[PDB]
Design a protein around this ligand. Structure first.
Ligand code: HO4
Ligand code: HO4
Ligand code: HO4
Ligand code: MG
Ligand code: MG
Ligand code: MG
Ligand code: MG
Lengths: 339, 326
């Protein structure tokens, strides 16, 4: 028989961040030795950057966090019911905290946060030049999430049990790999679909212990082309061809053998590459590329909760990425127009 | 070393060896130097060997050999090493049980009656050995009938080092992946052997499923060459194949993979994270069962690795165990 949506069908958890964006200049990038299109975790030498950004530029504020973006876009495309998509994560008790709570509610997402006083809500600097964005994430509160404090409490765990599809960005592996593995194991032992993002090169470089521990449980791996290339370089694939990286990544040991792994790499304007059990194939597309990537996954997830074909999941991803790309931030004044 | 510190599973075989002649090789279209699984065209071969040649009988199976040599070099305690596998309830079965116990190995076999205990025919001509395995009972091993039962699975949990020959990938890749993944989860060392060229040629989907879990890969030079060819490595140099094999996807990043290729009386090649280095074989005999020497090398190596001795002392112990068995 045919599957059909209902509340808490999609589960996501990750770092809830408030994004602080501003058009900067090449000098500001060098002052902090930042590259134009990069995504890094805030080091201690970057502490000055967050004050200087707000002080010296005209900044904007938008709700962010990669998984959180994908879960809002998934909920939008799903449309009905409200709260089809669940989000968990940790924030501070502060102004930025409350903006985030409000934005998940306006997105009709069933958000359940772990809140605490010690750390302010996490923020992410987006320093823009041309069509480049240089992201620096200051996780703060987001880095305080603990399974025992939140995910394990039975009120919250119940909602993960409702889920048919789980999505967690690789980014969250820097904070609570124990939480990611508990959802991962659960998905495996109850034949639910578990899905992950490579998220950023630094995850494959510096967080591969958590990444490769979870990979055997990953039903669908998403990512973009530099992430794939960093992953291939780091895991000794001895190739640069995206299609060959998708194929070797697809064939990695897998726990739940009742589902073959699917691997999807988006490529900006280049074609989106999908590796299944039996082939690797390109799909052409038809500027926040980072956000477009998150929206692609939200589009894809939006159809995967219904068990639609993989082609239709890809086409929905491409559709959500083109829409959200034009409107900055996570609001949706229009309704999806996808058939 | 406590009891059950080293875990092994594989195909328990009784080896039936004899010096044969060229006619026998030709009759069964055998490679003078090879290791194959018995196909239908080989059914008659095992009877004809026993009947027409002067055969000898020894307890065998690659992993089983390595585990016995490991227990011997470890010495204490008795039952430092565990072995799982499947046999028949028959004469050859009982010889194997007896030999493991005399070896002080904690062998927990799955015994059943539909298939006889597996045998391996070693057909010698000159310095050539042509091995043909009739796995039989060995091939009946099933995780659900044995490995999964909690009294056996408990013994795998005791293990700090696991060793499985790639041979066992033809039989139960499900069992190998369960031990493999378990070692990874609990940062226990998981080790595997390339075992023979036919593993890479015909079971590479299973081989490459498990390779990410392999903390130490062992093998000889032809296995390394077959592996590089089948993996499209391009290079044929043993030191280079060791290096690219070392750098392959790895699921437990707490341990950098080590790759050891033996090469007969040539040097043993070892590739770690940061270098590849040759270690010579000092003590030379004339005349040799390289296959059995290879198994013994791994037993020697494992014997020191359960104590967390340096890699150089593991290798020296391997070279030492090989020269004894020769
Ligand atoms: C760096 C970085 C990050 C950027 N992002 C998100 O990338 C989104 C654009 O796709 C931004 O909204 C930012 O919050 C992260 N989300 C969770 N954890 C992270 N470490 C990051
Ligand atoms: C062929 C072969 C095999 C040879 N051997 C063993 O290799 C030892 C020589 O090192 C012999 O004792 C043979 O039984 C195998 N053991 C497990 N599975 C196998 N398929 C084989
Ligand atoms: C052939 C052979 C030899 C193998 N070995 C040992 O057995 C291992 C398995 O091939 C070799 O790496 C070596 O340690 C020898 N040791 C001393 N003299 C030898 N001729 C050999
Ligand atoms: Mg996230
Ligand atoms: Mg992205
Ligand atoms: Mg074996
Ligand atoms: Mg060998």
């Amino acid at each position: 028989a045919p599957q059909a949506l209902r509340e808490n069908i999609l589960f996501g958890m990750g770092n809830p961040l408030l994004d602080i964006s501003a058009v900067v200049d090449k000098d500001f990038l060098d002052k902090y030795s930042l590259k134009p299109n990069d995504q890094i975790l805030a080091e201690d030498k970057h502490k000055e950057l967050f004050d200087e950004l707000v002080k010296k530029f005209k900044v904007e504020y938008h709700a962010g966090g990669s998984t959180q973006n994908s879960i809002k876009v998934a909920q939008w495309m799903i449309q009905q019911p409200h709260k089809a998509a669940t989000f968990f994560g940790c924030i501070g008790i502060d102004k930025f905290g409350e903006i985030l709570k409000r934005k998940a509610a306006e997105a009709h997402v069933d958000a359940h946060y772990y809140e605490q006083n010690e750390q302010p809500t996490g923020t992410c600097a987006a320093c823009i030049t041309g069509d480049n964005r240089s992201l620096i994430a200051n996780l703060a509160a987001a880095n305080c999430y603990k399974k025992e404090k939140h995910l394990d409490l039975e009120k919250n765990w119940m909602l993960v049990e409702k889920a048919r599809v789980c999505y967690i960005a690789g980014f969250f592996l820097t904070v609570s790999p124990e939480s990611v593995l508990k959802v991962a194991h659960h998905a495996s032992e109850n034949n639910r679909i578990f899905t992950l993002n490579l998220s950023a090169p630094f995850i494959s470089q510096f967080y591969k212990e958590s990444l490769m521990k979870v990979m055997p449980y990953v039903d669908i791996l998403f990512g973009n082309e530099t992430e794939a290339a960093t992953f291939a370089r780091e895991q000794g694939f001895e190739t640069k061809d995206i299609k060959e990286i998708a194929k070797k990544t697809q064939a990695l040991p897998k726990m739940n053998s009742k589902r073959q792994r699917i691997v999807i790499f988006t490529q900006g304007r280049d074609d989106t590459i999908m590796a299944t059990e039996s082939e690797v194939t390109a799909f052409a597309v038809l500027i926040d590329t980072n956000g477009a990537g998150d929206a692609f996954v939200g589009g894809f997830l939006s159809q995967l909760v219904s068990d639609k074909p993989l082609t239709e999941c890809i086409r929905a991803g491409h559709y959500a990425a083109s829409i959200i790309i034009r409107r900055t931030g996570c609001t949706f004044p229009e309704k999806p127009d996808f058939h």
